Amino acid sequence: IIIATKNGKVRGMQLTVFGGTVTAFLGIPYAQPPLGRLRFKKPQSLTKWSDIWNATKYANSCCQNIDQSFPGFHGSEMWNPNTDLSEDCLYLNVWIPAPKPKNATVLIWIYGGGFQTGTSSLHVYDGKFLARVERVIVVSMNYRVGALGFLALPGNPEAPGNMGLFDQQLALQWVQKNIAAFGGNPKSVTLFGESAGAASVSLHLLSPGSHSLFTRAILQSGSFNAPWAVTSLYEARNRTLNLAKLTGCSRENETEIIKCLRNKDPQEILLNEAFVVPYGTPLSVNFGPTVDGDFLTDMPDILLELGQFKKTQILVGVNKDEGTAFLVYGAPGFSKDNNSIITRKEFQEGLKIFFPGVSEFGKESILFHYTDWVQRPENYREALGDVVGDYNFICPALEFTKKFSEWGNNAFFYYFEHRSSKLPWPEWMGVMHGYEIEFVFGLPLERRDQYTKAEEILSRSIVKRWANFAKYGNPQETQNQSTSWPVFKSTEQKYLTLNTESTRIMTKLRAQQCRFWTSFFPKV
Amino acid sequence: IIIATKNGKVRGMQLTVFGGTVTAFLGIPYAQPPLGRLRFKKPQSLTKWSDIWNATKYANSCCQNIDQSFPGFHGSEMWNPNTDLSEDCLYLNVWIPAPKPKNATVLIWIYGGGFQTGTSSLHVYDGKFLARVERVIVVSMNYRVGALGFLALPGNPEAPGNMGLFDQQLALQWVQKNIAAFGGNPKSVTLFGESAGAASVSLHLLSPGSHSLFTRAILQSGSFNAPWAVTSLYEARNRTLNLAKLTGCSRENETEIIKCLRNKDPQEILLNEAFVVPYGTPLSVNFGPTVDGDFLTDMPDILLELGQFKKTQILVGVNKDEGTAFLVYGAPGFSKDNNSIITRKEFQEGLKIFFPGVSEFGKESILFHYTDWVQRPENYREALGDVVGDYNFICPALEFTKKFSEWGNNAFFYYFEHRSSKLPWPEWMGVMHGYEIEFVFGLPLERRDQYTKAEEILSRSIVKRWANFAKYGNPQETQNQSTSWPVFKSTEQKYLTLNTESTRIMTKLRAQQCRFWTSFFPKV
């Protein structure tokens, strides 16, 4: 199977999925390799090839540091890259139903990883189930991460910032130009992403250059108003110069810092990213999106508040225990290998880990708000996870959703509360960050994979709802006497819970907690 | 002029006021003197006299401690009692227009003084101007204050608590039974009071026993939800027993503590009131209203929240600088005799004076909320006064008004912002607590008294508005092209400013401050 694209022919491969066939085109190039003088620059458009590009395997993942905290452990290792790392990493994947569809809706996946890590070739991002079961086309891209994707000296085209967001955008352009050849509808394109991938989706909603590149958006556990999502111009400058210092690249001329950094081995840039900040946290984003005057024209909070964004439907949600994953990456008393019963003093020390530049009063205020107990040994352990999840994911997603919906558009909010039967992490971590993704991609639809029957049913329902959102703007499951998913409006704030037992309509998720983070805490 | 009352004849006296005449009956008894075995008991009804009771001078003021902080100084001394102190103090005053009116509306004044001090014979409470100018009848009563008015051991008729509130109530009953003989309408009775007198008015709104004793209510700088206004049953017990200790009255039997206290000289009870608490403040109310199961059937906050109160119109207001008066009664760096520029550390020490049993985090939170400066030497001095005024008077009056109006009734709120040209206190204290009162009573209507012309005009307008509220439920001045006073509703929260220059309709008084006190601070 060979498809002709604007830049040349690509050969795919046939896959058997559930007694049917999917065609996969893995590793199509969508930009010039950003090597040499192109390092730190916006991606440059790719010129024609002749002969057939073989898109029959996943391409290189972008250069990135790896999580070495738990070698041999599937819970962490499943997120590490599974393809060689290389600066030559600007590739995308396409999965299409067979037979070729006529005008299929397109789902474009944007991975998370804190803007520092990630790749589209992870097993939990495999678009073949969606293509098979819902007859949508799935596209995913690799984009640059870390300093190589996000180093900024604002205004300077040698290192303007947001390069990895421009990579995403150019892959969106590729779909616009090329997807009809694969049987796709460029006028029916939904972005979906998790964590930094969801924050990215929310920035494409804000970016005038992305407005005509997609139709609708799905935000899983992330949005640009999250505290980790956008680097200030002040932080970015200091981090860029710190990185120059650490590599011997400190210079009088800023265009000469960049020239120097372009001579460094990728591996030397990677080694020094960790230290560009005095204190870090398990949620640090050393190199992330900045207000660059190009992708992002103003501080995104101002854009959101004043309604300057693409007017379309959004689907947004979070997991019940967003904060737990992070606690084993440095909070005292915590271990994935015991029940992590901590004391008051450990709790207090954990706040120092998660809120390093925060006044003592700021920290006491967190403790005040989260330790009014309803005695119980896991009180403090539970409070720290909620602190981290509410601050970093849940309250920001809910505020994004309120503010976005106030401008007239339909929004749907979910609260995912199912723990995978196969989860390798301990029970105390509950419904973790990242662990809805396999349900969205339909992994539990595979009977060989040993998920429960209740999990097959949940995943089939989520898959259908996501697909209906993409095709029709409305994440209903219309056939199986399912709970209707109400629109989220800033007054009632109705959301849908996703679980194997009973799906419920609820209101005002974490009302009391989010008043704290959203209205008090930003003042300290 | 001799009027026959249910309990006997009373002779009044004629007064010349503004080229006209008022009849004053000063010092009519309304209960049995609460002496001897009646000390600490509810007031007992008075039996008939023959011959003519001469109500031609003010009666004794109730026993109370005096403000000795500033001897010789009119600013403080004008609030001290101006009649002999005596346990024999249950008397009231009546001022009536001449000629005798036919069915005049009645204004009943309830003085403030923290429930510890006060008397109806103060010059600034002289009802003759109102009677003259508006042809209303004015009534005022003395009620017991301090431990003699409010000592409680709940349930025990020897000392049930709220005795001074029962004194007020019995004087309300006297007006019901007797005012028609003076030309008054018992079906048109408005209560008005300032500070503890306004808190009292707000408790009569809650008390089933007072419901048929009045029509409408005016609350000047006070309401029962103020932090100083209601003593917990826990505080009351401890204070009663502390007082017993300090007087040698500690006993096994509680009815024997009271018997013992009844043998003490009034003057010995007074000397020990100050110490019944370990820490006090300039706003301490050692002996005040309690939930006694009789006057007050439940915690008044519950009654207010759940709409269990007299359904009628209210007029409520506060002064611009409620908090300043108190700062010279113990805050470091403050003096009525210099400009009281204080430092951060003095500010912090002042919080300790005003918030003695409050956690360090509680205090830091106050400081956080009030020291975000918009440098300026008077920053800290101004912040402390606002802290004290917002917490103790303004935010509580506004919350009372919101909650009360949510039940359907018209409410009118004012913000009094005129500083008396004659004020003896320094300019930095601004528009002080207590200093609207002379405008309400029409003192500036007296040309001999050397107030400005702008002050005569302001007082004449307030007088008319207060009188119209009493007679008609609507505090308008209809004749002189005046600003219309809108109803206060919990959504718009419109209020009227009272000043000599420009009277304005404004909204959401101290919105940001009161969110702090009303919604955060009660948690610490």
Ligand SMILES: *[C@@H]1O[C@H](CO[C@H]2O[C@@H](C)[C@@H](O)[C@@H](O)[C@@H]2O)[C@@H](O[C@@H]2O[C@H](CO)[C@@H](O)[C@H](O)[C@H]2NC(C)=O)[C@H](O)[C@H]1NC(C)=O
């Ligand atoms: C901006 O960066 C400076 C630089 O300090 C850093 O030097 C880098 C090359 C890197 O190795 C990094 O780890 C190191 O901290 C920061 O100043 C430092 O601040 C810390 C803590 O306040 C102090 O211990 C150091 O004295 C100080 N270092 C120097 C050399 O000045 C600074 O914190 C940072 N500013 C922001 C916005 O975070």
Ligand SMILES: *[C@@H]1O[C@H](CO[C@H]2O[C@@H](C)[C@@H](O)[C@@H](O)[C@@H]2O)[C@@H](O[C@@H]2O[C@H](CO)[C@@H](O)[C@H](O)[C@H]2NC(C)=O)[C@H](O)[C@H]1NC(C)=O
């Ligand atoms: C849960 O484990 C933590 C984490 O650290 C430990 O991991 C264990 C599984 C074990 O292999 C141990 O050797 C390893 O150090 C425990 O916290 C540790 O416990 C003690 C006393 O508090 C200290 O020696 C360590 O500093 C501390 N580590 C950290 C990172 O804080 C924790 O006590 C344990 N909790 C249980 C069993 O409930």
Ligand SMILES: *[C@@H]1O[C@H](CO[C@H]2O[C@@H](C)[C@@H](O)[C@@H](O)[C@@H]2O)[C@@H](O[C@@H]2O[C@H](CO)[C@@H](O)[C@H](O)[C@H]2NC(C)=O)[C@H](O)[C@H]1NC(C)=O
């Ligand atoms: C209830 O009252 C007690 C009694 O203490 C008081 O004794 C009284 C007769 C009187 O002189 C008063 O000034 C004195 O404080 C309070 O206990 C006291 O608390 C303070 C400060 O915490 C301590 O310094 C004392 O040790 C302690 N005194 C005694 C003898 O126990 C107590 O504070 C109070 N409770 C409440 C609700 O405020």
Ligand SMILES: *[C@@H]1O[C@H](CO[C@H]2O[C@@H](C)[C@@H](O)[C@@H](O)[C@@H]2O)[C@@H](O[C@@H]2O[C@H](CO)[C@@H](O)[C@H](O)[C@H]2NC(C)=O)[C@H](O)[C@H]1NC(C)=O
């Ligand atoms: C305003 O006066 C205060 C109050 O105390 C003083 O009253 C003055 C009018 C004067 O007679 C003085 O003798 C009397 O003690 C001043 O605070 C005082 O100032 C000094 C230094 O801060 C200390 O000696 C006192 O402890 C302190 N008193 C109190 C109660 O805190 C204050 O400095 C003054 N401020 C000015 C002039 O701006």
Ligand SMILES: *[C@@H]1O[C@H](CO[C@H]2O[C@@H](C)[C@@H](O)[C@@H](O)[C@@H]2O)[C@@H](O)[C@H](O)[C@H]1NC(C)=O
């Ligand atoms: C494919 O359908 C096109 C329009 O369908 C889409 O309309 C969009 C506005 C959006 O709402 C999508 O979700 C809809 O599905 C049509 O214009 C094209 O011509 C079609 N192309 C084909 C059949 O080749």
Ligand SMILES: *[C@@H]1O[C@H](CO[C@H]2O[C@@H](C)[C@@H](O)[C@@H](O)[C@@H]2O)[C@@H](O)[C@H](O)[C@H]1NC(C)=O
């Ligand atoms: C005096 O007027 C009485 C009624 O007037 C009042 O009606 C109340 C319900 C209240 O709204 C007041 O503010 C009104 O002024 C009437 O019943 C009496 O009979 C009158 N008594 C006389 C003239 O002696």
Ligand SMILES: *[C@@H]1O[C@H](CO)[C@@H](O)[C@H](O)[C@H]1NC(C)=O
């Ligand atoms: C692409 O794959 C085809 C079919 O397997 C092969 O014949 C061709 O040589 C390939 N091109 C390469 C490896 O460049």
Ligand SMILES: *[C@@H]1O[C@H](CO)[C@@H](O)[C@H](O)[C@H]1NC(C)=O
């Ligand atoms: C910085 O150096 C570069 C060297 O390539 C040069 O192009 C540029 O003009 C210099 N900038 C300034 C303004 O000094």
Ligand SMILES: *[C@@H]1O[C@H](CO)[C@@H](O)[C@H](O)[C@H]1NC(C)=O
């Ligand atoms: C609805 O349930 C049927 C079985 O009754 C199942 O076969 C089908 O896949 C379900 N559809 C969805 C979208 O959940």
Ligand SMILES: *[C@@H]1O[C@H](CO)[C@@H](O)[C@H](O)[C@H]1NC(C)=O
């Ligand atoms: C009351 O006053 C009248 C008139 O001045 C007087 O004659 C009478 O004796 C008085 N009664 C007293 C003092 O008890």
Ligand SMILES: *[C@@H]1O[C@H](CO)[C@@H](O)[C@H](O)[C@H]1NC(C)=O
């Ligand atoms: C307390 O003592 C008084 C003495 O007058 C007595 O009437 C009462 O019965 C005693 N109470 C109890 C229950 O001990």
Ligand SMILES: *[C@@H]1O[C@H](CO)[C@@H](O)[C@H](O)[C@H]1NC(C)=O
């Ligand atoms: C209205 O103004 C007139 C003068 O024009 C004055 O005599 C009168 O007292 C005023 N009335 C009120 C109630 O303020």
Ligand SMILES: [Cl-]
């Ligand atoms: Cl600090």
Ligand SMILES: [Cl-]
């Ligand atoms: Cl369902």
Ligand SMILES: [Cl-]
């Ligand atoms: Cl403390």
Ligand SMILES: [Cl-]
């Ligand atoms: Cl006016």
